[PDB]
Amino acid sequence: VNSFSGYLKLTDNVYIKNADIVEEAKKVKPTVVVNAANVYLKHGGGVAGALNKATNNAMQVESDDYIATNGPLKVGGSCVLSGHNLAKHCLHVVGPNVNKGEDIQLLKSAYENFNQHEVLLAPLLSAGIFGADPIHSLRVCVDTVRTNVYLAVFDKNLYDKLVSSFL
């Protein structure tokens, strides 16, 4: 039993909800919140910009030190950093950005990072400003993630389309 509330169950291990991931994380304070990151961990907009804003830019400060030490992530890769005031940990995961011409096949690799964590709060990878089809992203999530994932979808209209079209 966990403290996630109001989710629709899609499969044995995938759940979904219309919610602002920032407000969700502040309420649940989950062990792991997933950020829709880029390789440089520059958290300017989308989920990343919103999560970083909620931390008063502490996420960005920590991220810049990480990059200065380690260099950029791989597309499809991830790193674990602090969750600051939002969660114990933040798993920064880089899904492909279609608006950069990045291979959508790397979306499965991106979701594989979730399997290293028993329970996660997450957005749909490569959705929003990353330019991928969110229905496809949900399909890959369900077919790749085996651990318990709680998906927050900010847009109410998009949430209804995701549920009504879920196979």
Ligand SMILES: CC1(C)CCN(c2ncnc3[nH]ccc23)[C@H](CO)C1
């Ligand atoms: C098209 C989208 C709705 C754009 C916004 N995205 C978010 N999802 C959940 N929580 C969020 N907080 C801030 C942003 C955000 C989604 C990521 O796929 C897709």
